[PDB]
């Protein structure tokens, strides 16, 4: 068996659960296997997640600036190269917190 190329048998799945009582109304869905209400839209790419929301004409974009050190004092920050990038608006820091 040391020389065998990787190979699996095909899957064999079993899901067991309880039927709802016999005299439960067909409109009473509690305990019945109702599919996720958004499943069809998720399958079709129509379900909207945050970034799928259309942008406003005047909408801006933000990117976080993070530490590359585990523990250190910040002695200085230079934004001169940042300011040269087209579309630059601002760099927010602790000073900017109202």
């Amino acid at each position: 068996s040391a020389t065998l190329l990787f190979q699996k048998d095909p899957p064999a799945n079993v899901q067991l659960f309880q039927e709802v009582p016999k005299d439960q109304s067909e409109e009473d869905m509690v305990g019945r296997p109702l599919p996720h209400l958004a499943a069809n839209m998720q399958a079709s790419g129509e379900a909207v997640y945050c970034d799928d929301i259309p942008r406003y004409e005047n909408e801006l974009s933000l990117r976080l600036v993070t530490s590359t050190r585990a523990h250190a004092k910040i002695t200085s920050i230079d934004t001169s190269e940042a300011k040269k990038v087209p579309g630059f608006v601002c760099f927010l820091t602790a000073e900017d917190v109202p």
Binding site: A38, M41, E46, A47, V48, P54
Partner: protein, 99 residues
Amino acid sequence: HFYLETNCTIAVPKGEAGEMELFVSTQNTMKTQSFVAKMLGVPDNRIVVRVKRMGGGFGGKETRSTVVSTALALAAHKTGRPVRCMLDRDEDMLITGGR
């Protein structure tokens, strides 16, 4: 009426389950919602109508606002895109009636 702000609606379709959000200069959110829903053929629970403020109404936005809202809601449904209409004063005076 000559409310300084004429009739205006923005309809934002949400692309799921017939859901739509309307931002409307109206005195009557309930009928705006009902008339849009009935035109589209969706339940009332899919349609949300929001009003922050109107630049005047004086009764003229109690029902007649809906002639703009429904057309706009329809364009939004059809295109899948937000759609906006503010009436020009000449359009508004012609269409919406008075005392």
